[PDB]
Ligand SMILES: NC(=O)c1ccc[n+]([C@@H]2O[C@H](COP(=O)([O-])OP(=O)(O)OC[C@H]3O[C@@H](n4cnc5c(N)ncnc54)[C@H](O)[C@@H]3O)[C@@H](O)[C@H]2O)c1
Ligand SMILES: NC(=O)c1ccc[n+]([C@@H]2O[C@H](COP(=O)([O-])OP(=O)(O)OC[C@H]3O[C@@H](n4cnc5c(N)ncnc54)[C@H](O)[C@@H]3O)[C@@H](O)[C@H]2O)c1
């Protein structure tokens with residue numbers, strides 16, 4: 001498959017380290033039924049968690065991960081809930097008392113977040129704030145947030161919201177509440193992504209729609225990225241911003257041409273449709289020459305400074321009442337260059 | 340195919356009636372990316388709506404229906420929003436001023452709603468209240484809610500919530516804000532349903548899991564159910580509880596055996612796993628002998644009495660904080676017999 005070709009095959013996967021980290025923990029995964037969340041759930045079971053609390057607001061996604069894990073039904077609890085509902089979330093944390101939260105709930109589609117910037121702010125930034133605050137209040141030991149390469153020097157609403165989430169969570173970290181954020185690039189074949197789009201175009205005898213002939217993305221298999229996130233979480237002492245080594249990036253045109261070749265449909269045209277609002281031709285390379293190494297060659301630690309939460313809480317209030325979200329985000333993330 | 344075999348093929352589908360109802364309207368569909376919602380969206384485009392506002396809190400679902408309708412992108416607006424967010428929802432209604440709301444957003448899985456009764460209450464009852472209240476305040480002309488056979492003499496939290504939603508919306512109907520609810524039974528191949536589960540078990544060489552050898556459901560194709568919902572909305576004058584003729588029910592064991600035969604499997608067993616909490620062996624037959632006929636042989640009107648909205652609103656406030664949801668629902672819906 002195209003997925004096989006573009007896998008990272010990291011040499012530094014470490015099952016026993018992840019097992020030592022997760023063994024007999026109560027773990028709560030937000031966005032449990034999503035592309036990333038579902039793989040986190042599966043690896044929590046694989047690596048010995050005692051009790052998995054699966055939180056998702058999408059009933060089909062929750063249904064599906066719970067069904068996928070039916071052999072482990074006695075050790076999993078499906079919680080149908082938005083992380084925006086602080087009272088209910090608080091009751092869940094009090095009831096089950098997780099020691100680890102893995103936070104993979106967010107809105108991610110760049111065009112939809114450009115079209116719905118208030119909902120992006122609410123779901124991503126406020127959702128993160130509510131979940132992180134409830135975690136810290138309820139004495140959750142460790143909190144790992146999934147982040148993304150689009151958070152680095154962002155040019156779109158989505159990526160900027162994730163950068164605010166990084167600032168918030170990392171600035172919450174202290175001696176009793178250890179926070180890590182892990183940035184990585186595209187996961188092969190995630191929900192609503194380019195590979196399934198191109199497969200559907202081919203199955204329907206449609207030209208492939210390519211945004212720009214030069215566009216590239218970095219890719220990893222979901223199982224690779226997730227296990228590396230868990231390795232990073234295991235070694236985290238709190239306050240770390242981790243970045244994953246994605247390998248070489250992939251030109252999307254080469255992806256398109258390879259899928260046409262694999263399907264034997266080279267009679268199909270590749271049609272160029274144009275770069276979309278806020279879209280980058282090349283996402284930022286994650287690992288900086290001054291980032292710190294870890295014991296895993298695939299995981300580095302990027303610099304981050306805490307911000308004053310009295311400031312950031314005020315600005316988060318502002319984002320909820322302001323007439324121009326793009327301008328309000330720029331006040332928090334001065335490197336935001338909204339395309 | 341199995342869906343072909345179980346299609347209702349109603350004789351009284353009326354394309355020109357639906358077109359007359361929908362042409363040049365601004366229509367908002369809640370749950371627009373869902374099984375029912377997505378078909379509503381597709382039919383709104385087919386039958387001539389001017390502008391479709393698609394509201395869904397699930398980003399993938401919204402993405403998918405917006406993508407499916409890409410040839411019509413200039414007349415559709417994807418709104419990534421929970422209907423529980425009243426302030427944002429009011430802004431949408433004030434901005435776009437839909438004339439018709441088709442309400443297909445809910446949680447429907449009986450087992451998950453048994454496990455998460457508070458979220459079933461909030462998403463179904465409070466969501467419906469917020470959307471219905473906003474619609475009436477924003478002078479939406481007509482509001483059509485999707486309901487279900489499980490709302491009749493309910494035995495599970497899900498079905499009981501939908502019953503409360505019927506009571507609320509119908510009690511809000513007046514001379515200026517016309518409400519209809521439409522009950523129907525199972526849609527063939529819906530999200531997370533038995534046919535996809537059986538298909539996946541067969542494709543992965545697993546025994547089929549059957550809850551009980553005698554269990555039956557009523558089935559219709561999604562396009563048939565949705566067109567009849569729209570025909571019902573079209574003829575509604577406000578306050579109607581409509582029910583669809585589903586035809587004969589289907590034993591799930593016969594469904595299982597037919598799926599095995601369609602794939603020439605004689606290697607797979609059917610394993611009986613048991614009736615789940617709140618589950619009925621036979622959902623209620625929707626058409627009562629005293630229901631009123633309409634001009635469509637597939638659509639009838641059931642009796643329903645308005646309730647006092649000041650009382651029902653107090654009950655809804657209580658449902659949000661109470662410890663005893665099953666008991667609280669029974670106080671609102673006296674015919675609720677919770678199969679615990
Ligand atoms: N897919 C990728 O390629 C990729 C790569 C790197 C990082 N990420 C990041 O990981 C995160 C998730 O991505 P994904 O691909 O799994 O997306 P997804 O949409 O498949 O999964 C997210 C899950 O979170 C749930 N959810 C969203 N908002 C919620 C809320 N308020 N409460 C409860 N549940 C909620 C969704 O229903 C869904 O099941 C995003 O921030 C994304 O940017 C994704
Ligand atoms: N599927 C069937 O067989 C069937 C038959 C008859 C009636 N119904 C009823 O129709 C309704 C929808 O069923 P379905 O099969 O389409 O389910 P579904 O889960 O496929 O679709 C529901 C949609 O509503 C969305 N949604 C849910 N809560 C929301 C909220 N708060 N705000 C915005 N969006 C929200 C979901 O994301 C989803 O896309 C349910 O009440 C169900 O009982 C279903």
Ligand SMILES: O=c1ccn([C@@H]2O[C@H](COP(=O)(O)OP(=O)(O)O)[C@@H](O)[C@H]2O)c(=O)[nH]1
Pocket residue numbers: 110186192193194195197209210211212215216217252279
């Ligand atoms: O129909 C499509 C969809 C996506 N893309 C490109 O494929 C890459 C991956 O897009 P996807 O939606 O998978 O993920 P994103 O990088 O936006 O998170 C991006 O460079 C897109 O511009 C494309 O060329 N055609």
Ligand SMILES: O=c1ccn([C@@H]2O[C@H](COP(=O)(O)OP(=O)(O)O)[C@@H](O)[C@H]2O)c(=O)[nH]1
Pocket residue numbers: 449525531532533534536548549550551554555556591618
């Ligand atoms: O694995 C399954 C799932 C469902 N069912 C039965 O199939 C019918 C339809 O179930 P579905 O989940 O499709 O819809 P529901 O009727 O619960 O809305 C019901 O009688 C279920 O008990 C079954 O026998 N095995």
Ligand code: NA
Pocket residue numbers: 014015016017
């Ligand atoms: Na090891």
Ligand code: NA
Pocket residue numbers: 038
């Ligand atoms: Na999967």
Ligand code: NA
Pocket residue numbers: 067068
């Ligand atoms: Na399975």
Ligand code: NA
Pocket residue numbers: 072073074075076077078
């Ligand atoms: Na369980």
Ligand code: NA
Pocket residue numbers: 307308309310
């Ligand atoms: Na401070």
Ligand code: NA
Pocket residue numbers: 353354355356
């Ligand atoms: Na006609």
Ligand code: NA
Pocket residue numbers: 377
């Ligand atoms: Na579909």
Ligand code: NA
Pocket residue numbers: 411412413414415416417
């Ligand atoms: Na559009």
